[PDB]
Design a protein around this ligand. Structure first.
Ligand SMILES: O=C(Cc1ccsc1)N[C@@H](c1ccccc1O)P(=O)(O)O
Ligand SMILES: [Zn+2]
Ligand SMILES: [Zn+2]
Ligand SMILES: [Zn+2]
Length: 231
Protein backbone atom coordinates (compact mmCIF):
# COMPACT_ATOMS: atom_id res chain seq x y z
CA UNK A 1 0.00 0.00 0.00
CA UNK A 2 2.60 2.56 1.06
CA UNK A 3 5.01 3.11 -1.85
CA UNK A 4 8.63 1.91 -1.74
CA UNK A 5 11.77 2.62 -3.80
CA UNK A 6 10.92 0.10 -6.51
CA UNK A 7 7.57 1.80 -7.21
CA UNK A 8 9.19 5.24 -7.63
CA UNK A 9 11.54 5.88 -10.54
CA UNK A 10 14.05 8.51 -9.48
CA UNK A 11 12.76 11.96 -10.35
CA UNK A 12 9.15 10.95 -9.64
CA UNK A 13 7.09 11.71 -6.54
CA UNK A 14 4.21 9.68 -5.10
CA UNK A 15 1.55 10.97 -2.72
CA UNK A 16 -0.09 8.79 -0.07
CA UNK A 17 -3.29 9.86 1.70
CA UNK A 18 -2.93 9.17 5.43
CA UNK A 19 -6.19 10.77 6.56
CA UNK A 20 -8.67 13.43 5.52
CA UNK A 21 -6.55 16.35 4.36
CA UNK A 22 -3.20 14.74 5.25
CA UNK A 23 -0.81 13.15 2.78
CA UNK A 24 2.78 12.10 2.78
CA UNK A 25 4.96 12.74 -0.23
CA UNK A 26 7.52 10.08 -1.16
CA UNK A 27 10.56 10.61 -3.38
CA UNK A 28 13.91 8.89 -3.95
CA UNK A 29 17.56 9.83 -4.24
CA UNK A 30 20.55 7.78 -5.36
CA UNK A 31 23.60 8.15 -3.15
CA UNK A 32 26.78 6.05 -2.85
CA UNK A 33 25.36 3.52 -5.29
CA UNK A 34 22.17 2.89 -3.29
CA UNK A 35 18.65 4.28 -3.55
CA UNK A 36 16.92 5.85 -0.55
CA UNK A 37 13.27 6.88 -0.13
CA UNK A 38 12.35 10.08 1.67
CA UNK A 39 9.06 11.31 3.16
CA UNK A 40 7.55 14.73 3.66
CA UNK A 41 4.04 15.83 4.62
CA UNK A 42 1.18 17.78 3.04
CA UNK A 43 -1.60 19.18 5.22
CA UNK A 44 -4.76 20.85 3.94
CA UNK A 45 -5.71 24.19 5.56
CA UNK A 46 -9.03 25.32 4.17
CA UNK A 47 -8.44 25.71 0.44
CA UNK A 48 -4.62 25.91 0.64
CA UNK A 49 -1.89 23.39 1.47
CA UNK A 50 0.96 23.48 3.97
CA UNK A 51 4.02 21.53 2.80
CA UNK A 52 6.44 19.91 5.27
CA UNK A 53 9.91 19.41 3.74
CA UNK A 54 11.10 19.40 0.15
CA UNK A 55 11.34 16.23 -1.93
CA UNK A 56 15.17 16.18 -1.71
CA UNK A 57 16.50 18.28 -4.57
CA UNK A 58 15.34 20.78 -7.18
CA UNK A 59 14.20 18.20 -9.75
CA UNK A 60 12.24 16.09 -7.26
CA UNK A 61 10.70 19.20 -5.68
CA UNK A 62 9.55 20.48 -9.07
CA UNK A 63 7.98 17.07 -9.62
CA UNK A 64 6.43 17.24 -6.14
CA UNK A 65 4.66 20.51 -7.01
CA UNK A 66 3.43 19.05 -10.30
CA UNK A 67 2.06 15.95 -8.59
CA UNK A 68 0.33 18.04 -5.92
CA UNK A 69 -1.34 20.13 -8.62
CA UNK A 70 -2.30 16.98 -10.58
CA UNK A 71 -3.78 15.00 -7.66
CA UNK A 72 -4.92 17.63 -5.13
CA UNK A 73 -5.21 20.85 -7.13
CA UNK A 74 -4.89 23.25 -4.18
CA UNK A 75 -2.07 25.82 -3.90
CA UNK A 76 0.92 25.18 -1.66
CA UNK A 77 1.13 28.54 0.08
CA UNK A 78 3.67 27.80 2.86
CA UNK A 79 6.40 25.24 3.46
CA UNK A 80 8.35 24.31 6.59
CA UNK A 81 11.74 22.56 6.54
CA UNK A 82 12.30 20.41 9.62
CA UNK A 83 16.11 20.56 9.65
CA UNK A 84 19.00 22.02 7.68
CA UNK A 85 20.18 19.04 5.63
CA UNK A 86 19.71 18.81 1.87
CA UNK A 87 16.92 16.25 2.04
CA UNK A 88 14.79 18.87 3.85
CA UNK A 89 15.91 22.18 2.29
CA UNK A 90 17.12 21.03 -1.12
CA UNK A 91 14.33 22.35 -3.33
CA UNK A 92 13.61 25.48 -1.28
CA UNK A 93 14.73 27.61 -4.24
CA UNK A 94 12.23 25.80 -6.49
CA UNK A 95 9.48 26.37 -3.93
CA UNK A 96 10.43 30.05 -3.61
CA UNK A 97 10.45 30.54 -7.38
CA UNK A 98 6.96 28.98 -7.54
CA UNK A 99 5.63 31.53 -5.01
CA UNK A 100 5.65 29.31 -1.90
CA UNK A 101 6.57 31.10 1.33
CA UNK A 102 9.36 29.00 2.88
CA UNK A 103 9.96 28.73 6.64
CA UNK A 104 12.39 27.16 9.07
CA UNK A 105 13.59 27.90 12.57
CA UNK A 106 16.40 30.47 12.85
CA UNK A 107 18.71 27.67 13.98
CA UNK A 108 17.90 25.69 10.82
CA UNK A 109 18.43 28.73 8.58
CA UNK A 110 21.83 29.42 10.13
CA UNK A 111 23.00 25.81 9.86
CA UNK A 112 21.76 25.64 6.25
CA UNK A 113 23.79 28.74 5.43
CA UNK A 114 26.92 27.32 7.07
CA UNK A 115 26.49 24.13 5.02
CA UNK A 116 26.03 26.09 1.78
CA UNK A 117 22.52 24.67 1.45
CA UNK A 118 19.38 26.47 0.35
CA UNK A 119 17.94 28.79 3.01
CA UNK A 120 14.20 29.13 3.75
CA UNK A 121 13.02 32.73 3.69
CA UNK A 122 11.16 33.04 6.99
CA UNK A 123 12.19 32.34 10.57
CA UNK A 124 9.90 30.43 12.93
CA UNK A 125 9.99 31.96 16.40
CA UNK A 126 9.22 30.15 19.62
CA UNK A 127 11.05 26.88 18.93
CA UNK A 128 14.51 27.53 20.39
CA UNK A 129 14.21 25.53 23.64
CA UNK A 130 13.55 21.80 23.97
CA UNK A 131 9.86 21.19 24.58
CA UNK A 132 8.72 24.35 22.79
CA UNK A 133 5.66 24.09 20.56
CA UNK A 134 3.89 26.53 18.25
CA UNK A 135 0.82 26.30 16.05
CA UNK A 136 1.44 26.90 12.34
CA UNK A 137 -1.80 26.74 10.41
CA UNK A 138 -3.25 23.24 10.64
CA UNK A 139 -0.24 21.75 12.47
CA UNK A 140 1.72 22.03 15.67
CA UNK A 141 5.48 22.37 15.30
CA UNK A 142 7.54 20.95 18.16
CA UNK A 143 11.23 21.20 19.00
CA UNK A 144 11.94 18.03 21.03
CA UNK A 145 15.60 18.80 21.59
CA UNK A 146 18.67 17.76 19.65
CA UNK A 147 18.51 14.31 18.04
CA UNK A 148 19.32 13.51 14.42
CA UNK A 149 20.45 17.16 14.27
CA UNK A 150 20.48 19.97 16.82
CA UNK A 151 17.71 21.89 15.02
CA UNK A 152 15.31 19.06 14.16
CA UNK A 153 11.57 19.75 14.38
CA UNK A 154 8.65 17.36 14.45
CA UNK A 155 5.14 18.11 13.20
CA UNK A 156 1.78 17.00 14.58
CA UNK A 157 -1.59 17.21 12.81
CA UNK A 158 -4.15 17.30 15.64
CA UNK A 159 -7.24 16.80 13.45
CA UNK A 160 -5.80 13.53 12.10
CA UNK A 161 -3.55 12.33 14.99
CA UNK A 162 -0.61 12.21 12.55
CA UNK A 163 2.92 12.68 13.89
CA UNK A 164 5.66 13.40 11.34
CA UNK A 165 9.02 12.74 12.95
CA UNK A 166 11.34 13.63 10.09
CA UNK A 167 14.82 12.23 10.36
CA UNK A 168 14.73 12.07 14.17
CA UNK A 169 12.46 8.99 13.90
CA UNK A 170 13.57 5.80 12.12
CA UNK A 171 11.38 3.31 10.30
CA UNK A 172 11.25 -0.17 11.84
CA UNK A 173 13.25 -1.83 9.06
CA UNK A 174 16.27 0.37 9.86
CA UNK A 175 18.23 -1.32 12.65
CA UNK A 176 21.54 0.55 12.35
CA UNK A 177 22.14 4.26 12.74
CA UNK A 178 22.02 6.31 9.59
CA UNK A 179 24.19 9.32 8.95
CA UNK A 180 24.71 10.73 12.43
CA UNK A 181 27.54 13.15 11.66
CA UNK A 182 25.48 16.09 12.98
CA UNK A 183 23.50 14.21 15.63
CA UNK A 184 23.40 14.65 19.39
CA UNK A 185 23.48 10.96 20.30
CA UNK A 186 23.62 11.78 24.01
CA UNK A 187 20.39 13.78 23.89
CA UNK A 188 18.49 11.85 21.21
CA UNK A 189 16.70 9.38 23.58
CA UNK A 190 15.66 12.26 25.85
CA UNK A 191 14.33 14.19 22.84
CA UNK A 192 12.33 11.13 21.75
CA UNK A 193 10.82 10.90 25.22
CA UNK A 194 9.68 14.51 24.90
CA UNK A 195 7.89 13.55 21.67
CA UNK A 196 6.17 10.62 23.41
CA UNK A 197 5.18 12.86 26.34
CA UNK A 198 3.73 15.55 24.07
CA UNK A 199 1.95 13.30 21.52
CA UNK A 200 0.93 10.10 23.37
CA UNK A 201 -2.33 10.07 21.39
CA UNK A 202 -0.64 9.90 17.98
CA UNK A 203 -2.12 7.16 15.77
CA UNK A 204 0.14 7.43 12.69
CA UNK A 205 3.88 8.10 12.95
CA UNK A 206 5.76 9.02 9.76
CA UNK A 207 9.55 8.60 9.79
CA UNK A 208 11.80 10.74 7.64
CA UNK A 209 12.51 7.69 5.46
CA UNK A 210 10.42 4.59 4.87
CA UNK A 211 7.27 3.05 6.18
CA UNK A 212 4.85 4.73 8.59
CA UNK A 213 3.88 2.98 11.79
CA UNK A 214 2.70 3.79 15.27
CA UNK A 215 4.37 5.21 18.35
CA UNK A 216 6.44 2.00 18.44
CA UNK A 217 8.78 3.80 16.02
CA UNK A 218 9.92 6.04 18.89
CA UNK A 219 11.26 3.30 21.17
CA UNK A 220 12.67 1.51 18.14
CA UNK A 221 14.65 4.65 17.27
CA UNK A 222 15.92 4.94 20.85
CA UNK A 223 17.07 1.31 20.73
CA UNK A 224 18.99 1.91 17.48
CA UNK A 225 20.57 5.13 18.81
CA UNK A 226 21.62 3.52 22.10
CA UNK A 227 23.08 0.51 20.30
CA UNK A 228 25.07 2.88 18.10
CA UNK A 229 26.22 4.86 21.16
CA UNK A 230 27.62 1.67 22.68
CA UNK A 231 29.35 0.60 19.42
O1 LIG B 1 20.09 15.13 3.38
C1 LIG B 1 21.17 14.67 3.54
C2 LIG B 1 22.43 15.49 3.18
C3 LIG B 1 23.67 14.62 3.41
C4 LIG B 1 24.56 14.61 4.69
C5 LIG B 1 25.64 13.69 4.61
S1 LIG B 1 25.53 12.99 3.20
C6 LIG B 1 24.24 13.63 2.47
N1 LIG B 1 21.31 13.31 4.09
C7 LIG B 1 20.12 12.55 4.44
C8 LIG B 1 20.34 11.07 4.11
C9 LIG B 1 19.28 10.28 3.67
C10 LIG B 1 19.56 9.02 3.13
C11 LIG B 1 20.81 8.44 3.34
C12 LIG B 1 21.87 9.24 3.77
C13 LIG B 1 21.59 10.50 4.30
O2 LIG B 1 22.57 11.19 5.03
P1 LIG B 1 19.85 12.75 6.26
O3 LIG B 1 21.10 12.32 7.22
O4 LIG B 1 19.39 14.09 6.66
O5 LIG B 1 18.49 12.10 6.92
ZN1 LIG C 1 19.55 15.12 8.20
ZN1 LIG D 1 7.03 35.87 2.85
ZN1 LIG E 1 16.77 12.41 6.20
Amino acid sequence: EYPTVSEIPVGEVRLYQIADGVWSHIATQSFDGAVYPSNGLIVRDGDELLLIDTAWGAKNTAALLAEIEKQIGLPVTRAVSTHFHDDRVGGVDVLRAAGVATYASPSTRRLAEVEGNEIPTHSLEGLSSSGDAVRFGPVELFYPGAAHSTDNLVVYVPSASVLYGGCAIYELSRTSAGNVADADLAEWPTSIERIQQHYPEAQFVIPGHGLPGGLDLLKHTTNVVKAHTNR
